[PDB]
Ligand binder design. Sequence first.
Ligand SMILES: NC(=O)c1ccc[n+]([C@@H]2O[C@H](COP(=O)([O-])OP(=O)(O)OC[C@H]3O[C@@H](n4cnc5c(N)ncnc54)[C@H](OP(=O)(O)O)[C@@H]3O)[C@@H](O)[C@H]2O)c1
Ligand SMILES: NC(=O)c1ccc[n+]([C@@H]2O[C@H](COP(=O)([O-])OP(=O)(O)OC[C@H]3O[C@@H](n4cnc5c(N)ncnc54)[C@H](OP(=O)(O)O)[C@@H]3O)[C@@H](O)[C@H]2O)c1
Lengths: 292, 293
Amino acid sequence: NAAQAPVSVIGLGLMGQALAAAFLKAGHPTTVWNRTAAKADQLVSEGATRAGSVADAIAASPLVVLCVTDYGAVRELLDPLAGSLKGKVVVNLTTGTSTQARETAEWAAGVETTYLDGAIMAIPPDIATDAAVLLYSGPKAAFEEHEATLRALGAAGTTYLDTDHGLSALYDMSLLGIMWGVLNGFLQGAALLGTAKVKATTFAPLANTMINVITEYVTAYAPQIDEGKYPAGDATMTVHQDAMEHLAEESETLGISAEMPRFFKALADRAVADGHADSGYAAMIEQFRKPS
Amino acid sequence: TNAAQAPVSVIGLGLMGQALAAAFLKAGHPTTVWNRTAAKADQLVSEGATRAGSVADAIAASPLVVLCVTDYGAVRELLDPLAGSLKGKVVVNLTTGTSTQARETAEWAAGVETTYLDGAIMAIPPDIATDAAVLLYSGPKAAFEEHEATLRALGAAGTTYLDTDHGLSALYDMSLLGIMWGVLNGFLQGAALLGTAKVKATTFAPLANTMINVITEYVTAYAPQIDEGKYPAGDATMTVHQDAMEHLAEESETLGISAEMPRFFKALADRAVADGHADSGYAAMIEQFRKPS
Ligand SMILES: NC(=O)c1ccc[n+]([C@@H]2O[C@H](COP(=O)([O-])OP(=O)(O)OC[C@H]3O[C@@H](n4cnc5c(N)ncnc54)[C@H](OP(=O)(O)O)[C@@H]3O)[C@@H](O)[C@H]2O)c1
Ligand SMILES: NC(=O)c1ccc[n+]([C@@H]2O[C@H](COP(=O)([O-])OP(=O)(O)OC[C@H]3O[C@@H](n4cnc5c(N)ncnc54)[C@H](OP(=O)(O)O)[C@@H]3O)[C@@H](O)[C@H]2O)c1
């Protein structure tokens, strides 16, 4: 039970406030602390306990969640309190780099404390909804002990990765790259359809229907990438390349941007040059691996 | 019982045409077929399709006539000579082409008093007649409604009417392919990045798909902002997007993979910031996609 699983939240910015709110509404006794005291007021009025100091906030709970600007801020808060951390589980949902995650984990074992490094794939209003994804890396046992508590932040999207703490930051970037790819795809299409007086609101649901179809292509292409074998099946790179041609041309003609379609065409042109005219789109992995 | 009463002819039996005729046949339509190279019809004829001897026979055989050939040059070559023969027929042209070709062909069709729908197929042949198939139609609404049930044999869930401008089918086609490449390139970027830490693409795939599903909700929220020209930050400012694109690009260069796409994405964001949209949400990016380059 949640009443038997206390948790402290250190950092009550926009995201930290929503995490504390989620812990509280799921029935955890929730201790909070922020450098700027007034950011706790709304949460205190709703039943959270205001800690007197960072030390108190750590002592209050066996599970300690951090969510501040950067890992500089994290070290500033925790360095002085090494002794205070023994036997606690620290869950750091601050966004940072791979190396920061790994170095912080190293420092934590050094002072005998358990450390998970997380990454939040969500905006504050989506915390505690099925739309929330939250990634955790580090010791599996500590994740299992606190799984039920952590699921208060997003029951469906709470996801353990592996032991390397640095995976959380890598998966974060990788998923954001997908987000920008999807959204830029949609925006290109809205601009094109806009020249024929089609509204983006009219286009959205059909765009989403298509995005859902494409997830099946992701699933089919994945083993091809791992095996290094790129059978055309469906459609050759030559067919993709020709279709990219038409998108670029019709974009230049109708008076909108053609930069992305031309950039996409260039990548395909390189795969053709490397011998993959008759291979399928999975062969494009080779272009994304080539430096600069 | 309905399909037995709804004949359809298919003109063009290439890889895609064969799958369309197969779908019509297995849904119980009496299906007449014709191909220039006559032997490509054998498999379908053996399964119960009628071999039309000529294009004219194929047109006489059915009230609904579907074409699916290489290009609109091929389409005109086949149909021009048969103007008079087409009165009272519905011609459904699922050949891929440009906007202008659709509109010119529709003009020719009214000229010879026939009904003409211009379609585009967003599917591979094996996906025809599955819930994965999307098929787009533009032109007269009444003709689409009359034959909707029959057409749904090609993909019951994804058979979609757009509007009266015949040219819309080709525009929507391109727009959706752009989305496909954006999704797939996003996935490939991520697989290459995770591959440096010995994470397999198959381990990454399910999480990538979970995330793609979440992103559909962002598309839905951004769409009205685009139509209204008002781009409230809500969630995440362009400054936040810009910084995160920075980190993706840097970590990519460091780990020895391509950083061209992340840098290209950053460039577009840099221009939105320069135009004053630091505190706007991602919908403000529509302005960059509308600028001629
Ligand atoms: N907002 C989102 O949608 C979102 C999504 C995913 C991930 N994240 C990540 O979550 C983390 C927090 O984001 P946010 O949205 O809450 O940012 P924010 O609203 O700007 O708040 C930042 C928090 O860090 C604290 N802080 C900064 N420097 C500090 C220091 N030296 N000592 C003590 N406290 C310090 C702030 O204290 P004061 O309140 O005293 O200034 C505040 O509690 C970031 O790493 C962010 O990238 C955010
Ligand atoms: N394959 C796909 O995944 C796919 C997906 C979406 C859209 N499409 C579109 O579907 C259309 C057909 O593609 P496909 O994949 O079926 O191509 P295909 O396998 O190359 O077949 C082309 C068809 O067009 C016929 N043809 C070409 N010129 C002709 C002419 N002058 N007179 C009579 N017939 C002619 C061919 O007859 P012969 O057999 O006698 O050559 C054949 O039946 C294309 O516009 C394509 O872009 C295909």
